[PDB]
Amino acid sequence: GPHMKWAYKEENNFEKRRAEGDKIRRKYPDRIPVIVEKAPKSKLHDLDKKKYLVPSDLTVGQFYFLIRKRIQLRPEDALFFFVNNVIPQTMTTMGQLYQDHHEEDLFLYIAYSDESVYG
């Protein structure tokens, strides 16, 4: 996966992020709180919104299709997601990814890029 500068983590320290994660997980327990950010140097559209609350049983594949619409991509342009710095399987649910890969602040972080392989 790409080496990420997470703007959410640059702006907000762990204590602040954990408080927000705590709150949102109690308010919306069946939704996964996800922070989505673009890989540095990718020339894809930057998402206008980075914070999403996603149904737990939505698949990665279905999430690809929703994000694709929001970043104005064609069928010709490539889009790849990275969770825990690896590409998730398309049938995996957002709930399963959260269970396995949420950070200590209680968010799931997902990076996107037009490239699939990074040094």
Partner: peptide
């Protein structure tokens, strides 16, 4: 604020 999908 969070966006609901």
């Amino acid at each position: 604020d969070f966006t609901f999908l």
